[PDB]
Amino acid sequence: STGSATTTPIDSLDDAYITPVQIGTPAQTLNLDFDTGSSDLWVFSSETTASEVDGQTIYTPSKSTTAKLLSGATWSISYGDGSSSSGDVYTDTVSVGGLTVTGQAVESAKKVSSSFTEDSTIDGLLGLAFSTLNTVSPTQQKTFFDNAKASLDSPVFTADLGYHAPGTYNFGFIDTTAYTGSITYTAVSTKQGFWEWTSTGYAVGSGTFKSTSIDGIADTGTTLLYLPATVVSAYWAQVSGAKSSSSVGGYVFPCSATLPSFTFGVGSARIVIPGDYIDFGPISTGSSSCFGGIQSSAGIGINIFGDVALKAAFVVFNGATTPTLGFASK
Description:
By secondary structure, this protein is mostly beta strands. It has 2 domains: 5-174, Acid Proteases (Cathepsin D, subunit A, domain 1, Beta Barrel); 175-330, Cathepsin D, subunit A, domain 1. 6% of the residues lie in helices and 44% in strands. The strands form 3 sheets. Strands 18-17-12-13-22-14-21 form a 7-stranded mixed beta sheet. Strands 2-3-8-4-7-6 form a 6-stranded mixed beta barrel. The longest helix has 8 residues, at 229-236. The radius of gyration is 20 Å and the shape is globular. It is classed as hydrolase.
């Protein structure tokens, strides 16, 4: 089997991407944030505290003939940005882009934090990191990918995120029309439950490539590129007037600037992030200070290749017995 779904930016900054997912029978279509940095499939639901719902589409298990309570199971998750959600669990039929899984754990939110309530465009998350990070207790649950894997033509999914444009998530095949050149595969550590890999270095603009190992995760659920303070200082030093603002919470730059590109290494290959991908626009409406898309990881504890990096590439998440990541230009 295979699946193919379009993923669409939620706003003009590509802050996140939503992908339609069918849940239940008859289908209830919810727009989920596919997150290669977490492992829970959770949704706004008929159980979500009513004051915490503001325009999201909800899953109503009582209207699904295939929903079953997963008796006793609860979940609770906290993300890198300080957001959180929790609830109980149903199993149901879930389809993405024509690929159907029966018996998928659908984590029904009873509570969501303010950032979820305030984002009316995101109806929940579909985790695609390793199932060892799934938060369901007392019986940990599998991701949609892990449940689909055995049915897929190839045990892979691909992320092809757009710059200010829709893109695609494919499951079970690699669309050889979707990228240029060849795919460079690199080793993955699953020790922390993430798609964790080691970049071979970086360049700023037309500068020389610095060979240096940068361990980090491929995280579609994180907007920006978070890298070591040394690398981030070297990038922003090339932008007149850029500075790190403790009041704003990261590097800012004059909105009048033209930003340099940023290159990262994948083995002997190179992925170039155009400078415009690194512009996240005014810090507040009408400001001439703009927020940078490359930020320090120093206060995180991990480097994060988020959407700023990933959308510059065609990315293969190879879930073979020995997982690997692939990157191609496009």
